[PDB]
Write a protein that binds this DNA or RNA. Structure first.
Ligand SMILES: [Mg+2]
Ligand SMILES: [Mg+2]
Ligand SMILES: [Mg+2]
Ligand SMILES: [Mg+2]
Ligand SMILES: [Mg+2]
Ligand SMILES: [Mg+2]
Ligand SMILES: [Mg+2]
Ligand SMILES: [Mg+2]
Ligand SMILES: [Mg+2]
Ligand SMILES: [Mg+2]
Ligand SMILES: [Mg+2]
Ligand SMILES: [Mg+2]
Ligand SMILES: [Mg+2]
Ligand SMILES: [Mg+2]
Ligand SMILES: [Mg+2]
Ligand SMILES: [Mg+2]
Ligand SMILES: [Mg+2]
Ligand SMILES: [Mg+2]
Ligand SMILES: [Mg+2]
Ligand SMILES: [Mg+2]
Ligand SMILES: [Mg+2]
Ligand SMILES: [Mg+2]
Ligand SMILES: [Mg+2]
Ligand SMILES: [Mg+2]
Ligand SMILES: [Mg+2]
Ligand SMILES: [Mg+2]
Ligand SMILES: [Mg+2]
Ligand SMILES: [Mg+2]
Ligand SMILES: [Mg+2]
Ligand SMILES: [Mg+2]
Lengths: 244, 95, 98, 75, 240
RNA sequence: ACUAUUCCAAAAGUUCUUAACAUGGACUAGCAAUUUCGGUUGGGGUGACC
RNA sequence: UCGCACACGCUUACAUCAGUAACUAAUAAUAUACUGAUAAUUAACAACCAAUAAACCAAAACAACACUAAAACGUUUAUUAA
RNA sequence: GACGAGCUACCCAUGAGCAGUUUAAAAGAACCAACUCAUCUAUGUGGCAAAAUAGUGAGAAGACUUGUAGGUAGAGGUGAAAA
RNA sequence: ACCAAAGCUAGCUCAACAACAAAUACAAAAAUACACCAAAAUAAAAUAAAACAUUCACCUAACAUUAAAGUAUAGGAGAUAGAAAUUUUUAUCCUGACGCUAUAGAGAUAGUACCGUAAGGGAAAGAUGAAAGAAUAAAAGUAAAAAAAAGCAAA
């Protein structure tokens, strides 16, 4: 026997059926297409073509990303899109020596970050790279709004993004309750990033959180049959009164 | 020698045969003489000359080298400037 | 951040098919280390007068140690951002004015 | 309710009546309704196993039709 | 799989509390320290090592306490004394000659003329004379007694510098301590604990000590008589 | 690898320091890994030879 | 002359009537152990069966009193307990 | 990568035994039962028994035997070392 | 003459196409009292290299198909490993069988008996007829039918 459809497409046809079908289109579209993550550990070479040193002929040259590992703690902090590099190495770097299993862990630090939009000080575990990108993006909130999903890698980062994006689209008065001036200032320079309201609340979610939120938005306890029967009877009586 | 490959199921070639030998289309294989770059100051002018020369292999060898080489190296080749092209045909051979 | 390279060349798949990886593509030589690199300069703008570094409304080059943990958190300095530089084109053209 | 139990089956969970709320009830808390990653493999196997018993039941009903038709030259 | 420790008690009772001994095993049930177990079953009796401990939080002043009894304890090598005052009873480590029907003084006060102390006396280190003999010495003020608790041991006060006393531990390493640390003046009880003979192998199983292994080992480089220049002074004073 | 050691960077601060975590590269050990233990021979070993 | 109970553990192997040619018994006789039908051990014993505060240093040993190796085990008062 | 400490090794809980005789004595003392071991011989060797039976032996208030229930798991455990 | 012997079916292969109700995680199958939940770190070696240390396809993923090609390359440059650029592919409908017959074909009449403390292992078998609401004598082994100086058992 065989399977009517291959298994890699089982995971896909999971989405085409049931409650997933009722999820909003924008969410799905965002989930499907994955922009390729900015190289962190491996170092890319720009040119599509190279010239072989020994062979002396142009060579089609491609880039393969190095698999990196994200521990469960990393999902709680901002590591700058990096993690553990698992691999092997040759001792002495002579290919002829012993091959040995090895793991490079990133260096972690405890730091505090300030939000204009969330108006708060968070204690986050960050990497050097995280502070560098926070630097180059010129704001913490800039760093979070200016970055794609694949580059943050953290549930914390994406729920941060979702939170403050929602706060932007709501135009919340709670931001700086006593100062309309600082509201003007703070909201203005991020006004590049404003997204509509129905989009903002779905942006940080995970498929379980999506399924759950959708479930809750779809809950209606079944209408008593008495209701529908009364409606039908009234319809019949009105049609009978009108025909006469 | 791999008689059936993993991915293509074809028959693989031994590359170490392709680096030291040359197949003419007659079927003669042509090889360098062992130790020609080795310890020259010891040897006579005579031996040096004998070492610089190319040579032909007996039936037992050519046969063996053929089993380690796919169809692609038994192919007829016309190169521009090909030195050996004048040597690839057999003439006046009455067996 | 450790920058890493593979010892064994990976074959190609170019039609959009994903690259087919084997176990020998898991040995790594360490090419470069980020934390062993020399530090750069942080270009900032001062909203006030810092003791050694600068007068109010000036362009400063700090190091990330002093810059990240002092100026930006306390509100002493802001980032090099162009939109934030126009602000001091403004303050500077209204300074020598009045 | 409809639940996904430990073994990855889908199950009909009949409720029960307790004197206290569900987050405060000990026994109800250590009952797990959800599956773990490795269960995904087993989930597959029975889908596959079931598929065989169905597939080779068909092939019995086929044969039955043929024997009878060659044994009884109808019409 | 799991285990739970026996040491849960939140309150201080002088009534002996039942203790569960674990021979050699950590909380994962594996042998960590060899050769422990099967002792005679013992109760534990709580000790208060902070000797200056104002009973009612309101009144700050010095204590006068009374010695009701002196008993044997299985848990430690020294002998224990039951001391009461106000509404409070405590087991404290008894000094060498302490007898039932005795009086003990506890004060944190430091006078410039110091004091002459009995054995059942507890004073701050800086309030004692330069030559005196001490035990149950506290490390950092308010932390309780740690060093010199064993059977028949004593420390000695050496010198005082910058409001900080120097003491000599039984191993003769010297210890640097703030003046406000409380200490007891004297020797610990039962000074003859060292000369007791264990008659048979039986006494060992009674004390809860298992026989050694039967594995034979060459002595390593570690073995021989090493003569070391005495380990330098330990300083519990931290710089400003 | 790990457990300890010592050092250099990193990290924080000073104008040279390291409180406990903690990463990169070394070092020095312990505990410890992976793999073998050539051949002739008036049997093998020892002796002798290749 | 390893007897009667309980604990643990076994599960109808126990009881009555009936049948045994052949199955179980290492043979027979007949049957507590094979086969069929029918019945059966009845709770006062045993299991299940409260919390939290506070007082209480003071061995079992025929227990006076001690010995060293330092000893399992709760009463009573207060607050609530269908 | 699972599963095993209902055997046995060692622990942790909670129980239970030890009559008589001798001695001021429960003293890792005597004598000798229950109880525990296994010395020596003969039977047995597809046994009654995948380690027994008969005699004969050691110990027998102690580093003693023993019941119920936990614990440590193979690159390990446990070991009064017999690898 | 005994013991035996014979059936052709149960079902399998491979491939296309696409009975509630109650009870349950107390020591599962026990209506009912104060909590906690929940968790993650590269596949290794056997084996090839006639030893063995670097290295050893397949073992995860999908990508298919005809080629480029066992070519470029990668390799104790040994054993072996091995691409891409660029090219090819007409629709469904149209299901069956030079597939097995009860030592086969599923392990299957069953995950059951039984064996394991446990993970786990894991069998054996059916045959008259329309109707039982009708009662061939061919394997070995033996029997009918003990054996008479002598010897690879016959010629
Ligand atoms: Mg292609
Ligand atoms: Mg002790
Ligand atoms: Mg010793
Ligand atoms: Mg020894
Ligand atoms: Mg290896
Ligand atoms: Mg040899
Ligand atoms: Mg030899
Ligand atoms: Mg010889
Ligand atoms: Mg010979
Ligand atoms: Mg020799
Ligand atoms: Mg019973
Ligand atoms: Mg019989
Ligand atoms: Mg157990
Ligand atoms: Mg046990
Ligand atoms: Mg007696
Ligand atoms: Mg005795
Ligand atoms: Mg006799
Ligand atoms: Mg005796
Ligand atoms: Mg004796
Ligand atoms: Mg022992
Ligand atoms: Mg030995
Ligand atoms: Mg030996
Ligand atoms: Mg090999
Ligand atoms: Mg071979
Ligand atoms: Mg070998
Ligand atoms: Mg492999
Ligand atoms: Mg069968
Ligand atoms: Mg069973
Ligand atoms: Mg016959
Ligand atoms: Mg004859």
């Amino acid at each position: 026997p065989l399977h009517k459809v291959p298994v890699g497409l089982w995971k896909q046809l999971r989405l085409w059926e049931g409650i997933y079908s009722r999820l909003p289109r924008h969410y799905l579209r965002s989930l499907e297409e994955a922009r390729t993550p900015t190289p962190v550990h491996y170092r890319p070479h720009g040119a599509k073509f190279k010239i072989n040193p020994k062979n002396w002929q142009r060579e089609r040259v491609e880039d393969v990303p190095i698999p990196v590992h994200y521990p469960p703690e990393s999902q709680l902090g901002l590591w700058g899109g990096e993690g553990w590099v698992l691999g092997h190495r040759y001792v002495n770097n002579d290919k002829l020596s012993k091959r040995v299993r090895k793991v490079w862990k990133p260096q972690l630090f405890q730091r505090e970050l300030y939000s204009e939009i969330l108006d708060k000080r968070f204690t986050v575990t960050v990497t050097m790279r995280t502070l560098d990108l926070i630097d180059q993006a010129c704001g913490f909130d800039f760093y979070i709004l200016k970055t794609p999903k694949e580059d943050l890698c953290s549930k914390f980062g994406m729920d941060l993004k979702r939170g403050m994006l929602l706060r932007l689209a709501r135009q919340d008065p709670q931001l700086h309750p006593d100062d309309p001036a600082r509201r003007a200032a703070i909201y203005d320079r991020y006004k590049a990033f404003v997204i509509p309201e129905a989009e903002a609340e779905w942006v940080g979610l995970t498929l379980d959180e999506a399924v759950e939120k959708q479930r809750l938005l779809e809950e209606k306890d079944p209408i008593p049959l008495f209701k529908i029967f009364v409606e039908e009877l009234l319809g019949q009586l009105q049609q009978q009164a009108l025909s006469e | 020698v791999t008689y059936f490959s993993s991915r293509k199921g074809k028959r693989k070639t031994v590359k170490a045969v392709i680096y030291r030998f040359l197949r003419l289309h007659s079927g003669l294989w042509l090889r360098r003489k062992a130790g020609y770059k080795k310890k020259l100051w010891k040897k006579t002018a005579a031996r040096k000359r004998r070492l610089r020369e190319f040579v032909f292999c007996n039936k037992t060898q050519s046969k063996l080298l053929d089993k380690m080489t796919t169809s692609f190296w038994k192919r007829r080749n016309w190169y521009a400037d090909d030195p050996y092209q004048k040597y690839q045909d057999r003439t006046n051979l009455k067996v | 951040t450790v920058i890493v390279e593979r010892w064994w060349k990976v074959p190609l798949a170019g039609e959009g098919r994903k690259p087919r990886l084997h176990r020998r593509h898991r040995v790594y030589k360490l090419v470069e280390d980020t934390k062993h690199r020399p530090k750069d300069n942080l270009e900032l703008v001062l909203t006030q007068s810092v003791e050694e570094l600068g007068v109010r409304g000036d362009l400063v080059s700090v190091k990330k140690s002093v810059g990240r943990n002092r100026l930006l958190p306390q509100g002493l300095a802001v980032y090099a951002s162009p939109e934030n530089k126009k602000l001091f084109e403004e303050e500077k053209l209204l300074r020598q004015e009045g | 309710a409809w639940r996904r139990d430990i073994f990855g089956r889908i199950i009909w969970h009949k409720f029960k009546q307790w004197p206290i709320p569900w987050y405060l009830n000990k026994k109800y808390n250590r009952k797990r309704f959800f599956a773990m990653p490795y269960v995904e493999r087993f989930v597959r196997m029975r889908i596959e196993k079931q598929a065989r018993i169905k597939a080779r039941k068909r092939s019995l009903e086929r044969k039955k039709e043929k024997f009878l038709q060659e044994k009884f030259p109808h019409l | 799989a799991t285990s739970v420790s026996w040491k849960s008690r939140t309150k201080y009772t002088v009534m002996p509390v039942k203790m569960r001994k674990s021979g050699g095993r950590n909380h994962t049930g594996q042998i960590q320290v060899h050769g422990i177990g099967g002792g005679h079953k013992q109760r534990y009796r709580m000790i208060d090592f902070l000797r200056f401990r104002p009973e009612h939080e309101s009144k700050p002043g010095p204590f006068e306490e009374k010695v009701i009894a002196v008993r044997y304890d299985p848990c430690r090598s020294a002998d224990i004394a039951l001391v009461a005052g106000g509404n409070r009873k405590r087991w404290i480590i008894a000094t060498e000659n302490m007898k039932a029907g005795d009086t003990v003084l506890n004060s944190d006060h430091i006078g410039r003329m110091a004091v002459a102390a009995r054995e059942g006396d507890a004073h701050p280190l800086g309030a004692l004379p330069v030559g005196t003999l001490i035990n149950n010495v506290e490390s950092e003020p308010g932390r309780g007694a740690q060093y010199i608790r064993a059977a028949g041991t004593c420390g000695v006060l050496l010198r005082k510098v910058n409001g900080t006393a120097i003491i000599q531990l039984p191993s003769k390493r010297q210890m640097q301590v703030l003046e406000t640390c409380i200490a007891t003046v004297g020797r610990v009880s039962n000074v003859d604990h060292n000369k007791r003979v264990i008659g048979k192998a039986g006494r060992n199983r009674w004390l809860g000590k298992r026989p050694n292994s039967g594995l034979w080992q060459r002595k390593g480089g570690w073995a021989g008589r090493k003569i070391r220049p005495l380990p330098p002074m330990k300083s519990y004073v931290k710089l400003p």
